[PDB]
Design an enzyme around this catalytic site. Structure first.
Site, short mmCIF file in Angstrom:
data_model
loop_
_atom_site.label_atom_id
_atom_site.label_comp_id
_atom_site.label_asym_id
_atom_site.label_seq_id
_atom_site.Cartn_x
_atom_site.Cartn_y
_atom_site.Cartn_z
N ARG A 1 -31.35 -14.12 44.58
CA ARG A 1 -32.03 -13.07 43.85
C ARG A 1 -33.55 -13.13 44.08
NH1 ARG A 1 -34.09 -13.12 38.07
NH2 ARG A 1 -34.30 -11.00 37.42
N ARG B 1 -47.25 -1.66 28.40
CA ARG B 1 -48.21 -2.76 28.52
C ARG B 1 -49.44 -2.52 27.63
NH1 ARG B 1 -45.60 -6.60 31.84
NH2 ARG B 1 -47.06 -7.67 30.45
N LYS C 1 -28.85 -3.05 35.22
CA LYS C 1 -29.22 -4.05 34.24
C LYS C 1 -29.27 -3.36 32.87
CE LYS C 1 -32.70 -6.90 35.53
NZ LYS C 1 -34.16 -7.06 35.74
N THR D 1 -29.41 -15.06 32.43
CA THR D 1 -30.64 -15.41 31.73
C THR D 1 -30.37 -16.55 30.73
OG1 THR D 1 -31.57 -13.15 31.92
CG2 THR D 1 -32.64 -14.60 30.40
#
Ligand code: K
Ligand code: MG
Lengths: 505, 502, 517, 513
Positions: free
Chosen positions: A60, A107, A242, A300
């Site tokens: 990955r 952000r 995802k 994860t």
């Protein structure tokens, strides 16, 4: 007394659990694919070679960080390490390359005003906070929560303006600069792909990547945008969506049907949704993927502690085992391999646990349920595939051998979750790499020329699978195996099952 | 749309998994008991009060460290915090006290001797005397020896008169007077150490509810603990800690002799390969569920929360899967004893346990538990299963059980109802010990025994009803199940009533 | 080793079948109700007494034949025989009376007492013109159904004389059909006509049935078996005819043609129960399909918790012979295994040579078959198929059946005024007999419609204290079970009662040892 | 909506029953074999021709009555009728011949007399009472009767009409009390409920009849009154070398045979649930229990089981069955019976053809109503794991047939075995078993769902072509008989090599044009 075969015979799930035996050693084959994030700890040719020997199947690449030049070098090193085993095709293991998109981002007990006016970009302060998502006011209402810095801070909107929100802090802490923002429960209208993602995807096509892990997929139309960016040239690249927020979970069905597979992105998912609910989302996604016959990745913080330590925590051992038991096609390492100490030990541990857990599956119930839940169809390959899995349970076969060009015939075997490893013989190198996405497919790349006579060319590839299985220690001479082929040139498709002893030669 | 009831109705486990819904909120009741190790982070009266409010049900005291004086003060603080809620018996939560005993170059050569060399502790001089006199007799050609919580590994090569010579498998820096484990060996050490005899006597004196007995390898070990507790300590529950190969292999005889089991994953994962711990965990939880005896899942469940305010995703998963496996209790071991965020770790166990209790596939679990239970002439058994069946049929807010010894409530819990089991007792020890069993919410009735038996029963039933309303398990007009007896004493539970909440 | 309890423990249906054991004797109790048609072989007081002792639970009266005075005398004789055992309430068995309606019919005309021959593929014109009423021959046939032409099309079949003859309509007229004979034979006079697949618009109840129903109300019958029910509105017409006076009479709909099978669900919902009326049903539909309709009706009745009767030709040969055929033994056993609440005898008890032997054989077979039920799977399925409900009695009832399996209880004892509490237990199909204690004599008679309910009629006065009155009735059930040999001292039984005097408050289950009397 | 396929999809047996649909018509194929007893109503060539067209698969010959000459003529007529269809091998139906033995009997001596419930009756073994049977003293021909009965035992005379209970036990006599009276005639059959009867496995007459069956090339023997494994072995040895390929179906007809069923089944090629004599030996209310147990255990072992006797009894006199009879046939099929049988109904009744036709109609309805979902799960769970490739192939093929709703499972077989292996997993789809062995083809009728077809084409020199020829023959058969058409999917089982034992190849093929 091997492979948890006493437990396999139990009439109930409870008795199955009760007969699980630490003194029943697993078989040598490990069916669950291992995906390793490559980074500073794992990019050298020398480390990547051991990485492959330890059990990495997919490299990955995370495009959240690093230039095109940096990642091109990682891919080159992966290929160098991979191709160093190519001289013995019996022992050569295909290794896939996966590109993980950065994806869109937001952000940058007291009162706290969010603003959209760009003059506050340079003066972020503890009273007034600037963010970059211009449509935030359309997707949030009074009562909405806003999470800052991987869910460290939490705000609740109290009033709604033209260009601003006034919030109350729920969970305090230290606010820094350029920190990530999450909007729990919102229909976020950020584009399916950022400007940067379009460039990265085009780069993946250029670099011949085998799959894309597309970030922050919220709806079917997001998957379609990724597909269109990949275009005609990248049409054979598998898109793994995802799932990382509430909307993605709620619209899972439409996303699955449009995708080639799914990543349960537990990191961001556990920021977006309460952490206590992640296992719910994980199990629902793995189940529905198994029901659709589409690959599903568990990702994860499996082995997180092994960033610093040579051995995992007991929770981490458990997590890996339970992902496999749930039905995951693919366990993942995210920094355990990228930047940690002990990258090799983390790969090895996933291998060890996956194999133990594969033996502990209650095949008897899983197979019954996969058969009952599967639609009837006139498709011969589907019928051949289920027939082959049934035959493999009836004779405890050492393997199911499948000759396949596209991979599809092997994929159809894998969805019925045989215990026996599926040796998929292909001449297509991309098929061989991509097959790692599917539980139990051991891909092998035949480099022999196409023989003139079709029958001999079939037998050549079957004998290759036989040599592979002997050499890898899946079976020995005299053991029974299942062989799936087509009957007739390139015409038709996989429709022929043979039950054969493994030959002396 | 609530408590994963869409998933509950699925005809297959696969469809059950597929219907699990993050937007189906759980009930307020949380069935899985939370056991917290008390230590420097969690001993103050003030912290213990929040600890209880956050969901601690059992205080674990680890006799690996600390004097009798230190532990006596911890117990006192637990009781002070616990009894601070005693003024409102509606809201009083019993809190158990548990005593946990503790009775024990990469290729370079090292000689282990038994002759005393406590004066020297170097790699040149090789591995120290250690305390285990019989080590040579219990190890063979091939055997492994693990030193310092499994950091170092040795393989025995030659066997002598007074000594064994090993080659190290896993190298590292060797310290002094550290722990040694013998994978696969029949360890001859006594069931209870000299120190443990003193600690057990102290537990009797301090009125503990249960003992977690370390390193149980065989039934005769459990019997030695029981005999040490003696007549005085006959009501103290013994939870056997399974922590090595032999304990796993002899699990059946140990279970039969014990009041329950702790899956002691720490030492277990040092003794056996770490990849196999989940096998042993699932087999032990299953067999406990099958025998109707409590089982604790222990050790690194939320380990990272020692340092951080939130767990890892693997930790979230581990807690959920222990509950799904069937564990009666979950444990915290240093997350609560010495970490930051002790309260947040307790709260997280509470949150996850509740979610996972809703996600259990009761339809299959109940079928299997019913089929795997022997038929019996025992009326209480029939009443208990009848009551669980009725509770599934009407989605009851609770099963209310009047019990002296706890046994009647235990018999309900073994059939794994969805509904919380409100166990009304006057016996304070019963109320504390009931936390060992999935789904029993114990409540301690402090009202005097009424002259009329029927009135005294109704009093206790209405107490349970007030508890359930106040804790938000049910409201007026919901239906509940009530279990009582026909007669004053224990062992006559035979009557089940389905009643709307007043 | 008894009651097929080895077979009960099997994990699979196949292994269950494999462990069925001829050397595993059943328990004394027989759960399936036996309904006996009364006629010349079985009407005397003396024969009815033995009939009861042999196991009759329900006396069926067929209003196809016989005057009101004839049937009134049968009812009287049933009551005489029934009440001759009433001096011992411990041993008194309630006996229901059922009135089976004639129902609507299509009939042929005449031609004195001669017959004619219908052949092969010869032409036959049916007429509605009344000039041919007494002039039927092999060229022209007269029928009494005036709307026949509206309900039949080109291609339709018409069956004459209990399906002996078969015709296919080829042309369709105003007042006529011209047909081709498919199946020939000897055509007599006043013969019955069936219309396979047709929506027959005959009234729900005939002129004669109105009289018969009024008579049933006057005679205090427990139930009506209504013939030729085709739709829910037929059941409602029966209910309305019964009216206020007959509102407590149970209506059992007889399913006997295609339309009734197709509209089964609406009919069930409207009915108190069902008769699988295999006689006429097998004339209407192919005989090879009747088992399909039987199993579909039994299943859906078990799923709704409504009584179902399996009827007709169960022990047919025992009209003439003292022992049944192997197919008849099989049919009885399989009806019980299917789930039928009640089985039935028609000619076998009405007019045959061996009425008592036929009753006894049903008893013997039913009991063997009840032990051969795969309770493990039946109970799981009944529980899964049942809706959740907040109703306490439903939860109590299922709790009690569960408890009865857990302790292999000798009985479930239910106190019930209306019968409902006992009915709710029976629908979960316990193996243990359900001793339903009532003071209501009608409740006691009607309870025979439900598998497993052994009704007992308490005649003791209502005690002043409610608790004592409950205990009295419980002790009565205990004495009944001891005396009938269902259980003895020390065996475990289940007792369902309420918290409160009024009906619909059954919420209490006790698991109790049987005491010393 | 066509083959009880709505009901097929149900998640419970109860919902399955609830969805059974009179308006869901069955497909053409009828899987359950029909065995017809041949006698005066059904022996002519012309009747046997219609009998075959109506659905007879096995002609049963009852050696209780009739000479060798009589039965030789019946067999000849069966073969003439059968071979009249031989010119079109696409449509030809093999018809097996079965010999049913008389077996041992216990028989009374020598005009009737009245026996009364309560009264004494002394049985004697002294031969002076052969001609002098009366209401006080009775003759039997079983000399060891005294050794196999005790005080309390029952003795049944004349197909269970009379019933005696032994009260005292002597050297060569028994004194009994009559329980069930009646008219006692002469030369009447006796049954000994629950006794270990020591009569020989085969009588003198049976040895001659079995030797005659070998001479006549019969396909199977229904051996009477089998009580133990050693009885089946004595039949096998009497059949000898020349009769080694003749299938022995053991008739279970008394308590001892039921109790020792396991050892009998192991030794036999199959079983007949002989409900006739069984219901004389055991209480009639328990016959269903024995039936269900035997059918289950046969299904579980993969050996054929025949349900026999009184299935459509009333059709001896009437053109339509009773509702109990319709039910019985349907339920025998649902139980799992490989074959159903007709006795008087075809042998001596009116309506022999209508009885055959009715069995056909009901069998087909009931085959659609089977809950395959559960049956298949149970059969696969209960089957031992094995290294045997043919077993793996066979189960694989049934699984595939469910997955694609295949119109047939086509099996090439010499001995029949490969097709038998398929049939024990109870596919819905018919099993077209292609053989060149005419005996194989006849015998395959013993197994639910095997449609045997007799390939008469010459063996081609190239082995692969000869295989394809036989597969195409099956395809032509299925099209012609209306099992499937062009484009439908079918399952094809072959092997890797010539000769029996090598079936390992399963193909899922669309039917070509
Ligand atoms: K015979
Ligand atoms: Mg009728």
């Amino acid at each position: 007394q091997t492979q948890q075969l006493h437990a396999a015979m139990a009439d109930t799930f409870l008795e199955h659990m009760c007969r699980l035996d630490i003194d029943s050693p697993p078989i040598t084959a490990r069916n669950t694919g291992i995906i390793c994030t490559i980074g500073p700890a794992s990019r050298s040719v020398e480390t990547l070679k051991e990485m492959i020997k330890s059990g990495m199947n997919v490299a990955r690449l995370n495009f959240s960080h690093g230039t095109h030049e940096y990642h091109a070098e990682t891919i080159k090193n992966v290929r160098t390490a991979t191709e160093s085993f190519a001289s013995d095709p019996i022992l050569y293991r295909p290794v896939a390359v996966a590109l993980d998109t950065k994806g869109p981002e937001i952000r940058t007990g007291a009162t706290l005003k969010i603003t959209l006016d760009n003059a506050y970009m340079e003066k972020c302060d503890e009273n007034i906070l600037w963010l970059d998502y211009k449509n935030i006011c359309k997707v949030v209402e009074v009562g909405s929560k806003i999470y800052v810095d991987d869910g460290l801070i939490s705000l609740q909107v109290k009033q709604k303006g033209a260009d601003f929100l006034v919030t109350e802090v729920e969970n305090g802490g230290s606010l820094g600069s350029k920190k990530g923002v999450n909007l729990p429960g919102a229909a976020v209208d950020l584009p399916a792909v950022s400007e940067k993602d379009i460039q990265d995807l085009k780069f993946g096509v250029e670099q011949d990547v085998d799959m894309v892990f597309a970030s922050f997929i919220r709806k079917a139309s997001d998957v379609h945008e990724v597909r269109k960016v990949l275009g005609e040239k990248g049409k054979n690249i598998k898109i793994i969506s995802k799932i990382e927020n509430h909307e993605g979970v709620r619209r899972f069905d439409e996303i699955l049907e449009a995708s080639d597979g799914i990543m349960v992105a537990r990191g961001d998912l556990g920021i977006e949704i309460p952490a206590e609910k992640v296992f719910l989302a994980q199990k629902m996604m793995i189940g529905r993927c198994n029901r659709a016959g589409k690959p599903v990745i568990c990702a994860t913080q499996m082995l997180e502690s092994m960033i610093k330590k040579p051995r995992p925590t007991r929770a981490e051992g458990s997590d890996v085992a339970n992902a496999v038991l749930d039905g995951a096609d693919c366990i993942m390492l995210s920094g355990e391999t990228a930047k940690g100490d002990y990258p090799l030990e983390a790969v090895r541990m996933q291998h060890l646990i996956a194999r133990e857990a594969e033996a502990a599956i209650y095949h008897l119930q899983l197979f019954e349920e996969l058969r009952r839940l599967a639609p009837i169809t006139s498709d011969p390959t589907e019928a051949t595939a289920v027939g082959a899995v049934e035959a493999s349970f009836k004779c405890c076969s050492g393997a199911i051998i499948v000759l396949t060009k596209s991979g599809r015939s092997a994929h159809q075997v894998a969805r019925y979750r045989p215990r026996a490893p599926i040796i998929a013989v292909t001449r297509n190198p991309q098929t061989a790499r991509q097959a790692h996405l599917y539980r139990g497919i051991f891909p092998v790349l035949c480099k022999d020329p196409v023989q003139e006579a079709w029958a001999e060319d079939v037998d050549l590839r079957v004998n290759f699978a036989m040599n592979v299985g002997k050499a890898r220690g899946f079976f020995k001479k005299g053991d029974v195996v299942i062989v799936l082929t087509g009957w007739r040139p390139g015409s038709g498709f996989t429709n022929t099952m043979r039950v054969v002893p493994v030959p002396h030669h």
